[PDB]
Structure 1
Amino acid sequence: HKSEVAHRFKDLGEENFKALVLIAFAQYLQQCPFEDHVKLVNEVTEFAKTCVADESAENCDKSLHTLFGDKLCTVATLRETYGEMADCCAKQEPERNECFLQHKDDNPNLPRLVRPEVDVMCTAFHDNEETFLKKYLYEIARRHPYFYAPELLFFAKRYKAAFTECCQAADKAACLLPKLDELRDEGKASSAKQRLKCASLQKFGERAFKAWAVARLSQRFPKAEFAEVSKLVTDLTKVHTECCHGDLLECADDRADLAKYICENQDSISSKLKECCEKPLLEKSHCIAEVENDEMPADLPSLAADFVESKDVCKNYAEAKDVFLGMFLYEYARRHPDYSVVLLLRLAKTYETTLEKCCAAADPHECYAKVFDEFKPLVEEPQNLIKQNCELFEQLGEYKFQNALLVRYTKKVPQVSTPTLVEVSRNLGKVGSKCCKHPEAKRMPCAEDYLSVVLNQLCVLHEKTPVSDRVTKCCTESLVNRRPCFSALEVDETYVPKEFNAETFTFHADICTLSEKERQIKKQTALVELVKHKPKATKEQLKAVMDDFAAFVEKCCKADDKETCFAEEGKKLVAASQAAL
């Protein structure tokens, strides 16, 4: 590589290059208007083509960081707007790059992106496809400035694919808004996992990260040897150290090295990787991360022969403890893709705890011969809740199931704000939908994925304005004990029933004109506020107050003079409901 830009432009192509340079600049300079970044992109691009044409041409010998910082420092509004960022420009490059990273603000005071009417978007899409898309790519990019750029680009192409389909359609909103909802969900889910991988590495350490990674890579490449899994977990640990630090260009260099490696040693890693390795430079790593489990080898020995019965277990443990526990977790994991990653680490921590007592003890082989019995119950805890909650989701719909949860959690933690309880109850139910459609074989890894990002979001909102110490306990616990902690919460026996507020239980005639989505949030808020007023109420009592409410609405949204009904029946509903509690 005589020219780094020339090469990236060859490996990426003009279109991909422009998009990535835009995303890159919208991530450092988050307050400049769209049309200034377009001028910048086109000048960086005009210059890249100079180097493609002639590797020896003026300025083509320079580093990507060096060229990037230079173009950043040409902006004249820079001092007046960003201030301290401008002071970086005084430095020489190795120090200067580090300075632009220190002054990258996650979430500035930027207004929420309004979704326009479907009609507005489709007309816009048709009339100038490109500038419609880059303008929206520039908006997401300035708001989520630590969102790895190629993944952001990958989402972009799926928005483009949603409009191409749904603007030439029968009914646009019913086509498009679900596509856009599924995408928004994944963009929010993906942004949470990057945040979470990085918070995990810092708050818990290199050791629990590798543990997590070994469990993971072994479930997915079960035919690979442990030496090979080690090698991948080493390089992945470097990858995330670096990608957390924020240097887009060095983060991208590492992931691609990893994908180049994995595709060459494909033979000795996984059969299900042929497709991902035919894909071009940009997509490779992203694709490999999404790869399916390889099938495990047919008849695989039970583990007690080497980790429980055999002598020289302690003599193997003591030699190198973490590598032997690694040996273990690999072996356990590759036999059990139906387990959550955290289940497997709960087990490996259990085997650790015993080998500590029993290898320092009078008789080793005897003290720990029944260690596998400790597993049995640990395994059944998450399996039972999935048996039980997907039983309940099947009886009631998605929506009525959300209301079971909302009553459950409001009783466990009644101090939490109402919009928050309503929101997480609704997501838990959505997890219900996506995960209960999988068979027992796949349910626990499904939940692990969705619960971890629902639970991370929960602990952030709590960090900001705390509310319960029991919730603070669950959020300042190991990653392995996060979900059992939430699960171990009991109905708050201390909670003082809150003051009845009349207004809270008054319904006007507008809840007939609302959407199904809005109606549900209105009613759901009233259920929370009801469980907060009468915590000590039975499933039959609350089923009765609920059904009285079902008839009351149905009676008033199907009669002449809807409004006087809603205040006259309303008087009656409240008094009768007061009395039955």
Structure 2
Amino acid sequence: SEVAHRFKDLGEENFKALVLIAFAQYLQQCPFEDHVKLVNEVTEFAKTCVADESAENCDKSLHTLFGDKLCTVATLRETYGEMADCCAKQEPERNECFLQHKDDNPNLPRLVRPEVDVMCTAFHDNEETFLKKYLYEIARRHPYFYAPELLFFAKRYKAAFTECCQAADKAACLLPKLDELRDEGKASSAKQRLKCASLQKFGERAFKAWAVARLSQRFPKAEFAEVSKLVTDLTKVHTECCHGDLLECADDRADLAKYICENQDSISSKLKECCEKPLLEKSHCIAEVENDEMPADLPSLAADFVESKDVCKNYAEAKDVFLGMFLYEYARRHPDYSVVLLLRLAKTYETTLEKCCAAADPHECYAKVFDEFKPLVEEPQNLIKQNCELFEQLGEYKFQNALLVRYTKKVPQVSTPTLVEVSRNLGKVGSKCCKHPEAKRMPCAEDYLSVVLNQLCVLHEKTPVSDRVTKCCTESLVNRRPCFSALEVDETYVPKEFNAETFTFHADICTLSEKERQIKKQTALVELVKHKPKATKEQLKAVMDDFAAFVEKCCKADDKETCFAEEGKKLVAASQAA
């Protein structure tokens, strides 16, 4: 096992795909015919490394080889500025600036989709060149996308594209497949961006606590040792795949799939059918599985940590192992609880217990600790129940209207389309999981909503305008949502002056599509409510009703903007009646 580059475990066909995405992930050079001969020269380098070792220099580090072989590519300084700092050797490495040297750069405008015949013929003659073109096309938009998932999308692309040219269906055979592949790629790119961003920001202990809470919730039938080995190997895979070294990432995911499909008896009872799959299907199928059933007999954990007097000696012997025992025993029993709430309860437990061992008499200090968990769980169930019944009462468009009229008085200095996009995404989250029962509502409420808040945080991080929004972003991830939800109104906002030309419209608004009419409607609504900062919402509902009736009155009218001159005149005549 002295070989430093064993691609024979991966195979020759899989080796060429994983180096092209790494070259797209290291630089964004728009010619790519040199990328094919780059793949060819590194695979003949690999074929010379096959079966003889002492005659060559194949006993080197692969990250050093990514350092040195990229210098021969980067010879043009005005197009490749990655040689500006150093030559990127092993010990003076600059991978820590190569990670964000081109990250979040949408340099390409858009991808076009022509008619079915041209790439049907390109699939008919140049199919592997079309697949390389698709990997080069999708590898330039999101650079922090999960590298064992691209082979799954390429296999699904080949399987969904090998039958549409043969069958009579051409547009409808592939177009919703392309739409759902783009939507699944956007969702998985957002999830991988959130996970690698949390690993880059909040250390490693928070990632280990989050993953032991999730693995305690998913697999309840296992003991602590298999959970500890699984969380150590998953922490290793995610700390060495959001960084580079993609070959080790794919091989480590492969042996984790081998270990989880070879020791399935003591861990779970539902993935026995899931392990009867191909290898890429085995890698994808494990990450979305149903959680198992509860154990039949389980005692209360109040008997283990209250009347047991000798618990601080176990805490002084081991801290994080003892908190791992407490978090595993608390998250095995409650499947409806969110992971963020469980991390809040574990943090409250450790900051109570490190104060209670500071006292002289610790057994009277932790006599009442389970009363403090009642207001930490009494709030968000009532909040989710109240907003879910508001969605069940008013309907979805009025729910989006209510969430846009509610948050506009909290932070009234943020711009228009950021507010419109955040209110429409929270309307989608509120319409997503009120069709579920009460047990399956909290992970919807703390899973879909966490993408929208850090999306808003990285949108406000580029252009900082407010201060209390950025103050909530600088805290920990376990208290970001109560930092946002405990905001009140501000009295420091100046009332905006009266515009006269944006309240009026044009008579082709009925010719627009309904989504564009809605974007115009909440645009004029958010300008209308930022004109009047006073809490006069009891008149605003009737004003909204006669405004909607009086804009559909002019839809029946055909005066060709003459009725629209009398429309906005009566609206600004009725504007002062407040």
Choose which of 305, 308, 316 in structure 1 pairs with 2:306. 308
Choose which of 458, 463, 466 in structure 1 pairs with 2:464. 466
User: What's the CA shift string for 1:280-313, capped at 9, x where partnerless?
Assistant: 4445444322232122212321111112232222
Contact 2:5 2:62 in 1 (8 A): no
User: What's the CA shift string for 1:476-508, capped at 9, x where partnerless?
Assistant: 111111101111111223322212212221221
- The 1-side partners of 2:513 and 2:520 are apart by 11
C-alpha displacement of 1:434: 2.2
Alpha-carbon distance change, 504 to 128 in structure 1, aligned in 2, over 3 angstroms: farther
Indicate the SS of the match to 2:96. Answer: helix
Alpha-carbon distance change, 18 to 535 in structure 1, aligned in 2, over 3 angstroms: same
C-alpha displacement of 1:347: 0.9
Instruction: Give the structure 2 partner of residue 175 of structure 1.
Output: 173
**Residue segments in structure 1 that go unaligned for 5+ positions in a row:** none
- The 1-side partners of 2:309 and 2:276 are apart by 47
C-alpha displacement of 1:115: 6.0
- The 1-side partners of 2:178 and 2:466 are apart by 35
Contact 2:161 2:174 in 1 (8 A): yes
Q: Percent identity, please.
A: 100
Alpha-carbon distance change, 297 to 570 in structure 1, aligned in 2, over 3 angstroms: same
Contact 1:27 1:141 in 2 (8 A): yes
Alpha-carbon distance change, 417 to 11 in structure 1, aligned in 2, over 3 angstroms: same
Choose which of 481, 504, 509 in structure 2 pairs with 1:511. 509
User: What's the CA shift string for 1:545-581, capped at 9, x where partnerless?
Assistant: 221222123222233234322232122123213324x
- The 2-side partners of 1:242 and 1:481 are apart by 28
C-alpha displacement of 1:419: 0.4
C-alpha displacement of 1:407: 0.8
Alpha-carbon distance change, 102 to 518 in structure 1, aligned in 2, over 3 angstroms: closer
Q: Would you tell me which structure has more helix in proportion to its own residues?
A: 1
**Residue segments in structure 2 that go unaligned for 5+ positions in a row:** none
Alpha-carbon distance change, 534 to 380 in structure 1, aligned in 2, over 3 angstroms: same
C-alpha displacement of 1:89: 6.2
- The 1-side partners of 2:412 and 2:92 are apart by 52
Choose which of 344, 347, 354 in structure 2 pairs with 1:346. 344
> TM-score scaled to structure 2, two decimals?
0.87
C-alpha displacement of 1:328: 0.8
C-alpha displacement of 1:436: 1.9
Indicate the SS of the match to 1:54. Answer: coil
Contact 2:146 2:189 in 1 (8 A): no
Alpha-carbon distance change, 77 to 396 in structure 1, aligned in 2, over 3 angstroms: farther
C-alpha displacement of 1:524: 1.2
Alpha-carbon distance change, 445 to 116 in structure 1, aligned in 2, over 3 angstroms: farther
User: How many positions carry a matched residue from both structures?
Assistant: 578
Between 362-371 and 71-80, the greater mean CA deviation after superposition: 71-80
- The 2-side partners of 1:122 and 1:513 are apart by 36
Contact 1:325 1:348 in 2 (8 A): yes
Instruction: Give the structure 2 partner of residue 99 of structure 1.
Output: 97
Alpha-carbon distance change, 144 to 318 in structure 1, aligned in 2, over 3 angstroms: same
Contact 2:409 2:490 in 1 (8 A): yes
User: What's the CA shift string for 1:414-441, capped at 9, x where partnerless?
Assistant: 1111100000111111112222222211
Alpha-carbon distance change, 427 to 132 in structure 1, aligned in 2, over 3 angstroms: farther
Alpha-carbon distance change, 225 to 118 in structure 1, aligned in 2, over 3 angstroms: same
Indicate the SS of the match to 2:498. Answer: coil
> TM-score scaled to structure 1, two decimals?
0.86
- The 2-side partners of 1:439 and 1:168 are apart by 44
Contact 1:22 1:138 in 2 (8 A): yes
- The 2-side partners of 1:332 and 1:546 are apart by 49
- The 2-side partners of 1:389 and 1:104 are apart by 41
Indicate the SS of the match to 1:317. Answer: helix
Calculate the aligned-residue CA RMSD, in Å: 3.7
Contact 2:314 2:322 in 1 (8 A): yes
C-alpha displacement of 1:163: 6.2
Contact 2:164 2:173 in 1 (8 A): yes
- The 1-side partners of 2:199 and 2:74 are apart by 38
C-alpha displacement of 1:133: 4.8
Alpha-carbon distance change, 417 to 87 in structure 1, aligned in 2, over 3 angstroms: closer
Contact 1:88 1:100 in 2 (8 A): no
Contact 2:396 2:427 in 1 (8 A): yes
Alpha-carbon distance change, 483 to 241 in structure 1, aligned in 2, over 3 angstroms: same
